[PDB]
């Protein structure tokens, strides 16, 4: 009949909290911004911000603020005209429209309301579309126009090659993208734009056009989580960190054993993989590509945990060698479905612990697989390493002791319509978490078949005792006498198979 999960049982898996190790004070440094007044964090009481009263920077390597003194328009303070388009009756889509256009008269022909008009009138019903224009957004508005008392220091570009954390509060964040929602963050639409192209957009107003029925959701999903930060307030923090490493494991002579691996073809990585490194299969654009589009893994997790977009606020398109680590947010939409039939199911309470800092037990990394448009580039050993490098970026914590770290939560990275081979990128996985010296948690949705072969291999590789060097110099031979030479678009003897085979025929 076939087993619903193998290997190692995931409750012998290290989890935060329990694993975590004893954080020291929180405190600004050169490689932290803390936007909070530390002494005065208390458990369930929504932080005080750092410095008191705002300060403004507007320069290259800090946002541009929307409450900037040096925030122009048609010439005055843009944000006083926010002010002024904002404080007004919503009774009607076109209302809100109009308002959001006071301040972006450049994009009135090239920014389309329609899915925002037809989620007012035919998807919610009376009283609920009726509770959106009386309470939900003049609530967001208030919380919008809040920002200067809220967000008061500013905010650093986690540009590329930097290794820099930022830890804000959840209720900066409700205020920043509340403020991205009414599309205020300047610099951040133009086409042509120099400064903030290589970011991805932050300003929300992609979610209002079109004639998709994947907006609706979208819409859906997000004013659960308005309505619930409206509503209660609330009182964690979240941290970002770029890493960016320099340097690798030298693959073909590794020799660090492979690690425990629990896998599994029911459940989900936000549900079963609670404490432990979730991985998000990111574009290099977090969040979703430069545009948001799609209603993929990441684009997902970026809605039930929306605190998650605004890390596109300030972090830069990420680099071969680069990851976003984000540690804090908190779930509050629970959904069904994927792609074309993602549905927001209802809002979710977010039950986890918290750590010294506040923060809230959950770790999610932002790794982008390479999209492999034809199959056997994968195979090529460049690209093997590059995966390896990626997935090894996202699961290293350079000097957190091995007993300390949780297993990663992780799944189908780059697979499926995506071009990535799922075997391969298992196998990768694996070796890169054997390398970070973590456990492995792998869901496979569904396929019961490749939950089996994963375990088969892992267990052949552990059994036999490959180490990491060994286990990429079997890739390597895949590549060399069964990838290069072929014609066709896959190899007529797949990856396993010649594993095993060229183990067994060996010594």
């Given at each position: 009949?076939?087993?619903?999960?193998?290997?190692?049982?995931?409750?012998?898996?290290?989890?935060?909290?329990?694993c975590?190790?004893?954080?020291?004070?929180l405190?600004?440094?050169?490689?932290?911004?803390?936007?909070?007044?530390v002494?005065?964090?208390?458990?369930?009481?929504?932080?005080?911000?750092?410095?008191?009263?705002?300060?403004?920077?507007?320069?290259?390597?800090?946002?541009?603020?929307?409450?900037?003194?040096?925030?122009?328009?048609?010439?005055?303070?843009?944000?006083?005209?926010?002010?002024?388009?904002?404080?007004?009756?919503?009774?009607?889509?076109?209302?809100?429209?109009?308002?959001?256009?006071?301040?972006?008269?450049?994009?009135?022909?090239?920014?389309?309301?329609?899915?925002?008009?037809?989620?007012?009138d035919?998807?919610?019903?009376?009283?609920?579309?009726?509770?959106?224009?009386?309470?939900?957004?003049?609530?967001?508005?208030?919380?919008?126009?809040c920002?200067?008392?809220?967000?008061?220091?500013?905010?650093?570009?986690?540009?590329?090659?930097?290794?820099?954390?930022?830890?804000?509060?959840?209720?900066?964040?409700?205020?920043?993208?509340?403020?991205?929602?009414?599309?205020?963050?300047?610099?951040?639409?133009?086409?042509?734009?120099?400064?903030?192209?290589?970011?991805?957009d932050?300003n929300?107003?992609?979610?209002?056009?079109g004639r998709?029925?994947?907006?609706?959701?979208?819409?859906?999903?997000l004013?659960?989580?308005?309505?619930?930060?409206?509503?209660?307030?609330?009182?964690?923090?979240?941290?970002?960190?770029?890493?960016?490493?320099?340097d690798?494991?030298?693959?073909?002579?590794?020799?660090?054993?492979?690690?425990?691996?629990?896998?599994?073809?029911?459940?989900?990585?936000?549900?079963?993989?609670?404490?432990?490194?979730?991985?998000?299969?990111?574009?290099?654009?977090?969040?979703?590509?430069?545009?948001?589009?799609?209603?993929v893994?990441?684009?997902?997790?970026?809605?039930?945990?929306?605190?998650?977009?605004?890390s596109?606020?300030?972090?830069?398109?990420?680099?071969?060698n680069?990851?976003?680590?984000?540690?804090?947010?908190?779930?509050?939409?629970?959904?069904?479905?994927?792609?074309?039939?993602?549905?927001?199911?209802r809002?979710?309470?977010?039950?986890?612990?918290?750590?010294?800092?506040?923060?809230?037990?959950?770790?999610?990394?932002?790794?982008?697989?390479?999209?492999?448009?034809?199959?056997?580039?994968?195979?090529?050993?460049?690209?093997?390493?590059?995966?390896?490098?990626?997935?090894?970026?996202?699961?290293?914590?350079?000097?957190?002791?091995?007993?300390?770290?949780?297993?990663?939560?992780?799944?189908?990275?780059?697979?499926?319509?995506?071009?990535?081979?799922?075997?391969?990128?298992?196998?990768?996985?694996?070796?890169?978490?054997?390398?970070?010296?973590?456990?492995?948690?792998?869901?496979?949705?569904?396929?019961?078949?490749?939950?089996?072969?994963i375990?088969?291999?892992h267990?052949?590789?552990?059994?036999?005792?490959?180490?990491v060097?060994?286990?990429?110099?079997?890739?390597?031979?895949?590549?060399?006498?069964?990838?290069?030479?072929?014609?066709?678009?896959?190899?007529?003897?797949?990856?396993?198979?010649?594993?095993?085979?060229?183990?067994?025929?060996?010594?």
């Amino acid at each position: 009949p076939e087993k619903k999960w193998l290997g190692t049982p995931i409750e012998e898996m290290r989890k935060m909290p329990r694993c975590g190790i004893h954080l020291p004070s929180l405190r600004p440094s050169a490689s932290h911004t803390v936007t909070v007044r530390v002494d005065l964090l208390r458990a369930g009481e929504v932080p005080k911000p750092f410095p008191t009263h705002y300060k403004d920077l507007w320069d290259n390597k800090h946002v541009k603020m929307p409450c900037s003194e040096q925030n122009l328009y048609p010439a005055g303070s843009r944000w006083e005209l926010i002010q002024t388009a904002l404080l007004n009756k919503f009774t009607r889509p076109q209302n809100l429209k109009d308002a959001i256009l006071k301040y972006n008269v450049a994009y009135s022909k090239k920014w389309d309301f329609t899915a925002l008009v037809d989620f007012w009138d035919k998807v919610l019903e009376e009283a609920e579309a009726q509770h959106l224009y009386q309470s939900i957004l003049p609530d967001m508005v208030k919380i919008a126009l809040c920002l200067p008392n809220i967000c008061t220091q500013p905010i650093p570009l986690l540009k590329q090659k930097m290794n820099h954390s930022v830890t804000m509060s959840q209720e900066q964040i409700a205020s920043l993208l509340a403020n991205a929602f009414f599309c205020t963050f300047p610099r951040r639409n133009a086409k042509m734009k120099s400064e903030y192209s290589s970011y991805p957009d932050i300003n929300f107003n992609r979610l209002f056009e079109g004639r998709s029925s994947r907006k609706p959701e979208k819409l859906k999903t997000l004013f659960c989580y308005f309505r619930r930060v409206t509503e209660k307030k609330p009182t964690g923090l979240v941290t970002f960190t770029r890493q960016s490493l320099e340097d690798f494991p030298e693959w073909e002579r590794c020799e660090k054993p492979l690690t425990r691996l629990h896998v599994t073809y029911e459940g989900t990585i936000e549900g079963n993989g609670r404490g432990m490194l979730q991985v998000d299969f990111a574009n290099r654009f977090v969040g979703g590509g430069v545009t948001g589009a799609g209603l993929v893994q990441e684009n997902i997790r970026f809605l039930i945990n929306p605190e998650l977009i605004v890390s596109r606020l300030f972090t830069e398109v990420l680099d071969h060698n680069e990851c976003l680590i984000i540690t804090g947010t908190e779930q509050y939409s629970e959904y069904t479905g994927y792609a074309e039939t993602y549905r927001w199911a209802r809002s979710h309470e977010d039950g986890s612990e918290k750590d010294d800092w506040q923060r809230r037990c959950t770790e999610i990394v932002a790794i982008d697989a390479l999209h492999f448009r034809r199959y056997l580039d994968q195979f090529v050993p460049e690209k093997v390493r590059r995966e390896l490098n990626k997935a090894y970026c996202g699961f290293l914590r350079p000097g957190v002791p091995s007993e300390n770290l949780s297993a990663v939560a992780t799944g189908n990275w780059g697979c499926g319509a995506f071009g990535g081979d799922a075997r391969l990128k298992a196998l990768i996985q694996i070796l890169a978490a054997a390398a970070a010296e973590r456990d492995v948690v792998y869901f496979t949705f569904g396929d019961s078949e490749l939950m089996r072969d994963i375990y088969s291999m892992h267990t052949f590789l552990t059994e036999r005792k490959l180490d990491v060097g060994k286990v990429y110099k079997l890739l390597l031979r895949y590549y060399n006498e069964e990838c290069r030479n072929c014609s066709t678009p896959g190899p007529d003897i797949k990856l396993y198979p010649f594993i095993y085979h060229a183990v067994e025929s060996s010594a």
